Paper text:
Then we fused a fragment of ERH-2 (1-103) with the EBM of PICS-1(PID-3) (180-200) via a (GSS)7 linker, crystallized the fusion protein, and solved its structure at a resolution of 2.40 Å. The overall structure is a tetramer formed by ERH-2 and EBM in a 2:2 ratio. In the structure, the ERH-2 homodimer adopts a butterfly-like architecture with the antiparallel β sheet from each protomer packed against each other. Two EBM molecules, named as EBMC and EBMD, respectively, are visible in the structure with each of them adopting a helix structure. The EBMC is accommodated into a v-shape concave via contacting with both ERH-2 molecules, ERH-2A and ERH-2B, respectively. EBMC mainly interacts with the β1, β2, α1, and α2 of ERH-2A, and extensive hydrophobic interactions are found throughout their binding interface. On one side, I182, V186, Phe187, and Leu190 of EBMC make hydrophobic interactions with Ile11, Thr13, Met38, Phe42, Phe61, and Leu65 of ERH-2A; on the other side, Val189 of EBMC is accommodated into a hydrophobic pocket composed of Ala34, Lys37, and Met38 of ERH-2A. Taken together, each EBM contacts with both protomers of ERH-2 dimer through both hydrophobic and hydrogen bonding interactions. ITC binding data indicate that neither of EBM double mutants, I182D/V186D and V189D/L190D, displayed ERH-2 binding affinity, which highlights  the roles of  hydrophobic residues in binding to ERH-2. We found that the three mutants disrupting the ERH-2/PICS-1 interaction, including I182D/V186D and V189D/L190D of PICS-1(PID-3), and M38D of ERH-2, all display abnormal chromosome segregation and cell division.
By using functional proteomics, we and another group independently identified a piRNA biogenesis and chromosome segregation (PICS) complex (also named as PETISCO) that plays important roles in 21U-RNA biogenesis, chromosome segregation and cell division. The PICS complex is composed of TOFU-6, PICS-1 (also names as PID-3), ERH-2 and two mutually exclusive factors, PID-1 and TOST-1. The PID-1 containing complex is functional in piRNA maturation and processes piRNA precursors at 5′ termini via its association with IFE-3, while the TOST-1 containing form is essential for chromosome segregation and cell division in embryos. Complemented by biochemical and mutagenesis experiments, our structural biology data support that PICS is an octamer composed of two copies of each subunit, and unveil the assembly interface within PICS complex.
Author numbering:
A (entry chain A): 5 to 97, 124 to 137
B (entry chain B): 4 to 98, 123 to 137
């Protein structure tokens, strides 16, 4: 299921970027890599994390949503921040954020 | 009338992928025309008139351009790619790599 990840890192409209993926799994795993690249880029230390932190990470993004291709309808399903948080949660068990986003999104 | 996401990648670089969203397909198509018009205005010395064929070649310089258009009947988004967008721009009209990114960002991001 082809998936487009729409991210806006700051309140500026020109911080809107996107990446696309072969499946939601990879798109959500991309967000997880962004998060743990961000938390690692924040401590001079090997850091562990709470659940509240992955949620706060996603809430620091001014905008984040996914377009997920549904092969039964040939159309994209739109999922917003609430859904993505839940998904990122169940998988995981300030211009410094833009660098974390661009690291995984565009490389 | 129906919400539209405009996806653009101005150049081969992945970091050049950007987007805007619009309340209307017409707004999204209009936005692409204003990107071209901005691009046209930077030419050294050109005629004051343009053909749709020049709007085509502008869309052909983008590495990627597509639209996701909200289907009010299904609540999902129909994807539409460059050739469809060209035909819609054409229908509307009858009614450098750094310079191309600049023109896109100027219109797409206000």
């Amino acid at each position: 299921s082809h998936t487009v990840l729409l991210i806006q890192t700051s309140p500026r409209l020109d911080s809107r970027t996107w990446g696309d993926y072969e499946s939601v799994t990879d798109a959500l795993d991309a967000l997880c890599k962004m998060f743990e690249d961000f938390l690692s880029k924040k401590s001079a230390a090997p850091v562990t994390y709470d659940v509240s932190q992955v949620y706060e990470f996603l809430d620091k993004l001014s905008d984040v949503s996914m377009m997920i291709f549904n092969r039964e309808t040939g159309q994209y399903i739109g999922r917003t921040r609430a859904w993505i948080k839940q998904q990122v949660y169940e998988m995981m068990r300030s211009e410094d954020i833009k660098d974390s986003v661009f690291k995984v999104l565009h490389a």
